[PDB]
């Protein structure tokens, strides 16, 4: 095992041999950004996709253009933490090369013309960590991924819109990535119509004119040409027999001489088969058969050029005769097998009055631009720009793909542009399924559904900024001088950066980090939503997308989402799932071959997955045979069932990939209900890292793999040995093999001490290790606020018991003892930020110093000469922190205070106090601060002090840095002397600086001398550069806001401990609040006096069914026992070999375990420290579904020599007798919360008010009044407390004279009311009158 694993393991009950070592998990957005930065040459994405989509660009004249060259970034100016400190964003310089290429219009293309081939800076750009977030102004933040609807195409059919009918109206929509949508739609009257982006209806056939087509060219396509021919008297026609199919005969339908089908007789497949078989087409038919048919095409007389029958016009016997008289045998007509082939299009065509394409243009223009300006080029360019210009329309070739495959083409690609064949194939297809064939799809199928990561959206807004500039570009291209206008003489990058900062700061998604918990942050990262632009809405979206499609299986954990309006909307990703490069999704699946499962996989989509059959992982192979049971629960078709065995295509890898993470971490969920599960994993994320890192005991196995890729602590980049250790930092020696030649090969790791989140709780890091010891690579260095040996540790493993008490666990109510508090394992810590500004005024500059008027030196006692607190102190509400004062004017006072000042001689100055103080109700320890001051403002003395002190701290360690680094390297400058003799003690005792003056030789040994001089030079020079940079930026002042002069900030420290009302829970929805804490005496207790830790009324487990909690309790009750066996073996102090036996047997108990290990491989001391970690109780890993079972539990309990029920007598602490009966116990792992009453409870005597109504506020932060709803009024309405009603209306809110009078009456002892009339009333009167109304009162 790993050394970290050599020192502590976790038992496991996995039996199913797992295929996978799960992937890296923060892969996704890191790679998204990596795309959006990285240089694609050709298959452009993001950055380059936007550029190439844009450049080059010509003038509005058509003279001059400008061209792309290349891009690059700078390294960011600064490191990270200095921005954490300054409250700044880190970001890289953007520069872009460009070539201002123009061509002589004098020549045709005489490119002997202007080329400013220069480069530009424009726009710094928020860069990424190695963990993904972007810090913004000292704010760690998270922009969030999205899912939404894909471009391409989507068809639907609303079922009984006007349900008066009960009819389907099919309809279609096509959506680009940019540009206009488009809608096709039916009516009950079997007529197609159209609208863009919800414009109005239009009969689609107008557009067919608009697209330059004729009725000929249309119904050529839509219909076949039913030809009649009149042979010298009589009508004949070729007939496809399967036009008369499920149809009825009108006249005696006979043959050349033979009757197949009489009148009124169905043309049975018998006689369809005959007409085929006997092979007749040319069939005598009565001429009447035409009458009612429509003419296919415009026919005339050649001598006339006049329609005797117009195209799409009904035929008649007079027309029959006449058209025959003009000379016509062949008569093309429509084919109307209304069952199959018939009227939808001719209907709308007749309904379509635009004789010509030209009128179609007119009325298009008109509806779109209502009014009467018509000209041609307007509508022409209009239409052309809608769907046939690159400017205002693009598919996202994703959409092209999806569209082509709705079309069943073979080209994934095209343009972002239309063609007319496609349009008509659509209209066709639409009509075709209107005849009955085909279907529409379910959006809930995830092949309709595409993600949106960052580079996409970044590209979007970036392109927009490019266009914001491009407007000006055209304007200043065609107009300005051409020879001399630089390319950057045109540029303003401000709209660009504006868009950046907007999206990087003004998006629903662009939000803070959720930081309390590595789970919280990392699942906040692997979170998904679908809101925002081209997104959804609470009011409008409904259940059906909130409800699940089975396609989710393996791609989306259904388990994990918030609870309220955001319930079915917000969802995270299942574990082993990934994306289509398009943005669609995939999951891997194991192929199934001949019964034998193929150990390969493939990343199937949502769609293929339905086609194939797929198997599970609960499945039982026949030991490299096949599925044992004939009937194997497999699945295809959007549904599962039982199948045969070699029949199968594919398999699920694991039992797991369906799920995601907090759901994953819970064992015995199989024994648990789902509501409780969702809630438990929901508040699993509301963690609190406690004072130490106390593990749990039951596991699942993933938790190690979790603890790492938070990035929360260091790892072994390179195995080695520890040089140096500090309470703040460490230093290592890298192994030679890992070391590279030029580099020295040593790392430092300087650690994270007490610091804050967005959610403003402690931060700290520290080593789990010792020094002068080997290290393997990839290992950890230091655990964190909630971490332990590379494994999470958030809560508290301890004891549990189950019983009611005297009303101290009534309804969900939980109870506890006091020793817990002595162990203060729940005790935790907080900090607050406090700061202030120095400003310049209309009177003068504000200032700070100890000098204040009317002071008690009590407060001053702790403040420096600059008027500022010294460190180490403790403070509480009302104390002073910094004495700030502001230049004041002058005023006057009443004769009474004049009488006061006139005898005491009370004298004053012309300045006001504006000094910082502790807020009411707060106290804590003074530990750290800072100051910021302008480059331009004198740094008030102690600023310089800490400034200098900063140079003390920083440079010292930088000294320390080279004091190691540089130092070691000089081994070379010594060591290479050893060859060719060596000055054995004439080297050492005399000074090292004069070793150059020792023995020297010719040819090869002056080269070493100048090598020495070169390293001398370079090595001192490097630190000179360091010093320069560092002392500068530490000397760098502060670009303050205009009027701001310098700034101070401070931090205290605060600690918090446990109390009733503080909320509590574990891992099942098992909430609770404390109503009491118990002295240990009256605690019930056991035969052995070892009393209880926790009490709980058991009643609620059956109703909520958090059953696995019990199972946990059993297991932990066991596992503690073994730690105790061990514990006994140590004071008793047994031996090696007995531990050897006992423990080897111990972990070698279970039925069919997967994991396997030997013990003699290890040393003694490894075992010693291992057991030393384990004496408290054995850690166990429960895979949820491949977990352990009842039998092994009871087995190992019997080894623990315990009652199998674990259900035992107690004695009451108060009476010392026994209770009635045995009671269950064990160990469970328990957890506390954010929801702390200290952060909650609040009263309001009398304080701040509103400003227009002068009504009290709301908020503990603002001493806010509490609100009184209508409902609360209605209870009184039942009751009738008219005086109280009056009271609460008037003086508690509105009546000012009233409230004041009452204040006095109460300090007078008087409890006597006065009303007035509220403010908001007369406010509203003035409002009415402002609206030109004579509202007015009728006085008594």
């Amino acid at each position: 095992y790993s050394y970290t694993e050599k020192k502590r393991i976790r038992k496991d009950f996995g039996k199913r041999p797992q295929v996978l070592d799960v992937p890296y998990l923060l892969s996704i957005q890191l790679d998204s950004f990596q795309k959006f930065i990285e240089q694609d040459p050709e298959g452009q994405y993001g950055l380059e996709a936007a550029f190439r989509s844009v450049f080059p660009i010509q003038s509005y004249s058509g003279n001059s253009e400008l061209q792309y060259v290349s891009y690059r970034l700078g390294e960011p100016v600064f490191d990270v933490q200095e921005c954490q400190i300054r409250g700044v964003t880190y970001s890289a310089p953007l520069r872009v090369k460009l070539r201002l290429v123009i061509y002589e219009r004098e020549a045709p293309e005489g490119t002997v013309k202007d080329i400013k081939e220069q480069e530009v800076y424009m726009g710094e750009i928020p860069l990424m960590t190695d963990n993904g977030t972007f810090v913004i102004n000292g704010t760690e933040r998270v922009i969030v991924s999205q899912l939404h609807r894909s471009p391409g195409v989507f068809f639907d059919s609303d079922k009984g819109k006007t349900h008066s009918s009960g009819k389907v109206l099919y309809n279609a929509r096509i959506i680009p990535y940019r540009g206009s949508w488009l809608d096709f739609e039916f009516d009950p009257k079997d007529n197609l119509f159209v609208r863009i982006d919800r414009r109005r209806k239009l009969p689609a056939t107008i557009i067919l004119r608009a697209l330059n087509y004729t009725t000929e060219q249309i119904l050529d396509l839509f219909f076949e040409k039913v030809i009649f021919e009149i042979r010298d008297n009589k009508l004949q026609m070729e007939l496809v027999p399967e036009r008369l199919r499920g149809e009825t005969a009108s006249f005696d339908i006979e043959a050349n001489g033979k009757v197949y089908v009489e009148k009124g007789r169905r043309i049975t497949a018998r006689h369809i088969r005959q007409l085929e078989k006997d092979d007749v087409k040319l069939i005598e038919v009565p001429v009447e058969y035409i009458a009612g048919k429509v003419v296919a095409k415009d026919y005339i007389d050649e001598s006339t050029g006049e329609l005797i029958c117009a195209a799409n016009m009904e035929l008649s016997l007079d027309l029959l005769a006449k058209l025959s008289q003009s000379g016509h045998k062949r008569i093309e007509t429509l084919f109307t097998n209304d069952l199959d082939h018939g009227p939808y299009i001719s209907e709308t065509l007749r309904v379509d009055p635009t004789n010509d394409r030209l009128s179609a243009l007119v009325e298009i223009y008109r509806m779109m631009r209502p009014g009467e300006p018509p000209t041609r080029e307007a509508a022409e360019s209009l239409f052309e720009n809608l769907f046939f210009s690159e400017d205002r329309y693009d598919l996202s070739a994703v959409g092209r793909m999806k569209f082509n495959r709705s079309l069943l083409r073979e080209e994934i690609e095209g343009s972002g542009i239309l063609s007319k064949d496609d349009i008509i194939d659509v209209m066709k297809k639409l009509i075709d399924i209107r005849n009955g064939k085909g279907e529409v799809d379910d959006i809930d199928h995830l092949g309709n559904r595409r993600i949106r990561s960052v580079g996409e959206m970044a590209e979007n807004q970036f392109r927009v900024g490019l266009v914001r500039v491009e407007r000006a570009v055209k304007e200043r291209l065609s107009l300005g001088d051409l020879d001399t206008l630089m390319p950057q003489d045109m540029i303003n990058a401000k709209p660009i950066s504006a868009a950046v900062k907007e999206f990087f700061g003004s998006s629903q998604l662009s939000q803070f980090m959720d930081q309390n918990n590595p789970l919280s942050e990392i699942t906040h990262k692997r979170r998904i939503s679908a809101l925002g632009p081209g997104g959804l809405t609470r009011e409008r979206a409904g259940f059906e997308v909130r409800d699940v499609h089975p396609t989710h299986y393996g791609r989306v954990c259904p388990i994990e989402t918030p609870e309220g309006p955001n319930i079915g909307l917000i969802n995270s990703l299942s574990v082993y799932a990934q994306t289509n490069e398009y943005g669609f999704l995939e999951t891997p699946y194991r192929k199934v071959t001949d019964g034998v499962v193929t150990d390969e996989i493939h990343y199937l989509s949502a769609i293929e997955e339905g086609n194939y059959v797929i198997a599970q992982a609960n499945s039982n192979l026949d030991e490299e045979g096949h599925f044992v049971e004939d009937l194997v629960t497999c699945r295809s078709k959007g549904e599962s069932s039982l199948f045969s065995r070699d029949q199968v295509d594919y398999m699920d890898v694991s039992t797991q990939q369906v799920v995601s993470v907090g759901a994953s971490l819970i064992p015995f969920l199989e024994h648990d209900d789902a509501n409780r599960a969702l809630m438990g994993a929901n508040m699993q994320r509301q963690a609190v890292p406690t004072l130490r890192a106390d593990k749990p005991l039951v596991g699942t196995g993933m938790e190690r793999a979790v603890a790492v890729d938070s990035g929360v602590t260091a790892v072994a980049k390179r195995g080695g040995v520890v040089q140096y250790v500090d309470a703040s930092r460490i230093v290592i020696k890298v192994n030679e093999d890992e070391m590279y030649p030029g580099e020295a090969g040593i790392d430092i790791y300087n650690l994270t001490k007490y610091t804050r989140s967005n959610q403003n709780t402690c931060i700290n890091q520290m080593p789990c290790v010792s020094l002068g010891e080997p290290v393997e690579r990839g290992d950890v260095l230091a655990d964190g606020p909630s971490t332990d040996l590379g494994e999470l540790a958030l809560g508290q493993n301890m004891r549990v018991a189950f019983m009611p008490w005297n009303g101290y666990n009534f309804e969900d109510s939980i109870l506890v003892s006091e020793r817990v508090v002595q162990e203060d394992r729940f005790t935790t810590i907080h900090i607050q930020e406090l700061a202030c500004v120095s400003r310049d005024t209309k009177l003068g500059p504000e200032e700070i110093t100890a000098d204040i008027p009317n002071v008690g030196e009590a407060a001053l006692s702790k403040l420096d000469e600059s008027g500022i607190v010294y460190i180490g102190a403790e403070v509480t509400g009302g104390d002073i922190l910094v004495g700030k004062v502001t230049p004041k004017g002058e005023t006057q006072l009443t004769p009474e205070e004049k009488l006061l000042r006139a005898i005491f001689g009370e004298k004053a100055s012309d300045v006001k106090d504006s000094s910082l103080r502790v807020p009411n109700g707060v106290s804590g320890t003074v530990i750290d601060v800072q100051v910021f001051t302008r480059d331009g403002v004198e740094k008030d003395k102690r600023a310089l002090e800490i400034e200098e002190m900063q140079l003390k701290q920083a440079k010292k360690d930088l000294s320390e840095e080279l004091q190691i680094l540089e130092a070691g390297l000089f081994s070379r400058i010594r060591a290479v002397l050893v060859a060719g003799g060596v000055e054995a003690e004439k080297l050492d005792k005399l000074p090292r600086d004069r070793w150059l003056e020792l023995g020297l030789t010719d040819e090869e040994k002056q080269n070493q001398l100048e090598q020495l001089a070169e390293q001398y030079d370079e090595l001192k020079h490097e630190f000179e550069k360091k010093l320069e940079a560092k002392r500068r930026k530490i000397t760098q002042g502060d670009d303050l806001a205009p009027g701001v002069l310098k700034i101070v900030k401070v931090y205290l420290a605060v600690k918090r401990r446990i109390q009733p009302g503080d909320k509590m829970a574990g891992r099942h929805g098992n909430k609770g609040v404390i109503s009491k804490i118990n002295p240990i005496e009256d605690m019930p207790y056991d035969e052995n006096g070892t009393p209880v830790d926790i009490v709980l009324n058991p009643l609620g487990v059956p109703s909520r069914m958090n059953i696995g909690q019990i199972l946990e309790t059993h297991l932990g009750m066991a596992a503690k026992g073994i730690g105790d066996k061990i514990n006994a073996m140590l004071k008793q102090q047994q031996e090696v070999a007995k531990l050897r036996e006992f423990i080897q047997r111990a972990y070698d108990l279970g039925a069919d375990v997967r994991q396997k290990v030997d013990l003699s491989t290890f040393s003694d001391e490894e075992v010693m420290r291992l057991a030393e970690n384990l004496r408290k109780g054995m850690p166990i890993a429960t895979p949820v579904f491949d977990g352990a079972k009842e039998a092994e539990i009871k087995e190992l309990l019997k080894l623990g020599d315990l009652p199998t029920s674990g259900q035992i007598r107690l004695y009451d602490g108060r009476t010392g007798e026994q209770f009635e009966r045995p009671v269950t116990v064990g160990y469970m792992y328990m957890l506390k919360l954010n929801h702390l009453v200290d952060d909650k409870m609040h009263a309001r005597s009398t304080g701040s008010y509103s400003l227009v109504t002068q009504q009290p506020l709301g908020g503990k932060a603002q001493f806010g009044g509490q609100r009184f709803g209508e409902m609360e009024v209605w209870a009184l309405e039942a009751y009738g407390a008219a005086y109280t009603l009056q009271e609460m209306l008037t003086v508690k809110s509105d009546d000012v004279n009233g409230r004041t009078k009452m204040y006095k009456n109460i300090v007078d002892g008087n409890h006597q009311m006065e009303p007035g009339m509220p403010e908001s009333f007369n406010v509203l009167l003035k409002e009415i009158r402002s609206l030109g109304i004579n509202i007015e009162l009728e006085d008594e």
Partner: protein, 301 residues
């Protein structure tokens, strides 16, 4: 108004007033100058459009925004939805002399009693105390009263108790679905920050000790004091008006312990003996002779 940063803040309407001025100015300014009617028409359109915008931004047509990209709030919008005077600011109101906190149980308590973290009542009963200290003249006037308050003298608490006696108080949970979802109790003080109460009335409040919390109000005036003590005193309220239903059903545990008690095994022991009365029954079982669940003879009166 300005802000501490020197930063200023306005209402929508000052724009719209401002708008019209200039147009009317450019009306009259033009009307000095003898224009074609067409421009006048245009101008009047601008004017009455602004007028509509005052009365309603988004009624007749496409609404009007600043660089917010959002509409400017109508005069009408001040009266409107909930947002206007009616539902926000007039019928529902913020209140002085009220508070809130997380809550918990008093199993020991009686009806009229209620757990009270004391600072709450402390700051909420201040002018009682200031009239009272002027009366005692320890604090002759009120500055010193507050000073001595900061000084934390034991007398305060006695004085505080000396106030608080017989001074009823109001209990408040939301959502308030019927008149019984709030109540009126008598105060009881405690060295904690979790409110203890008589659990049964969760049945009334539909409440549970799983993260619920509540708010509190004061009957200052004697009329309110006595209305409280007389009307939504709980002894005056035990049933529904919906039905003749006892609303204080013994909820969950008392029922069960009692069920277990009044119980007729045959199994335990001491079968077929005889008593005088339940006092010796206590003595007898409590001696450890007997079953509390066993049919055996006794006398009653």
């Amino acid at each position: 108004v300005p802000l501490d940063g020197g930063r200023f803040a306005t209402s929508d309407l000052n724009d719209l007033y401002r708008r019209v001025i200039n147009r009317n100015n450019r009306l009259k300014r033009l009307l000095d100058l003898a224009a074609p009617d067409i421009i006048v028409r245009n101008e009047k359109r601008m004017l009455q459009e602004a007028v509509d915008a005052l009365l309603d931004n988004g009624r007749r047509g496409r609404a009007i925004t600043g660089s917010n990209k959002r509409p400017l709030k109508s005069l009408a919008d001040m009266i409107k939805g909930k947002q206007g005077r009616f539902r926000q600011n007039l019928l529902g109101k913020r209140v002085d002399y009220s508070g809130r906190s997380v809550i918990t149980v008093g199993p020991y308590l009686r009806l009229h009693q209620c757990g009270l973290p004391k600072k709450m009542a402390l700051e909420l009963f201040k002018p009682f105390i200031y009239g009272k200290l002027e009366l005692r003249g320890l604090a002759t006037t009120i500055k010193a009263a507050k000073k001595m308050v900061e000084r934390e003298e034991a007398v305060v608490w006695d004085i505080l108790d000396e106030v608080i006696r017989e001074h009823p108080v109001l209990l408040n949970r939301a959502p308030t679905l019927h008149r019984l979802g709030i109540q009126a109790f008598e105060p009881v003080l405690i060295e904690g920050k979790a409110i203890q109460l008589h659990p049964l009335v969760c049945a009334a409040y539909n409440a549970d000790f799983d993260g619920d919390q509540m708010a509190v109000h004061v009957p200052l005036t004697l009329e309110a004091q006595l209305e409280a003590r007389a009307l939504m005193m709980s002894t005056n309220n035990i049933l529904s008006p919906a039905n003749g239903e006892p609303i204080i059903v013994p909820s969950q545990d008392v029922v069960l312990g009692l069920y277990y008690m009044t119980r007729d095994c045959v199994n335990a022991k001491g079968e077929g003996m005889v008593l005088t009365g339940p006092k010796e029954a206590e003595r007898l079982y409590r001696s450890g002779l007997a079953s509390l669940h066993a049919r055996v003879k006794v006398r009653i009166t």
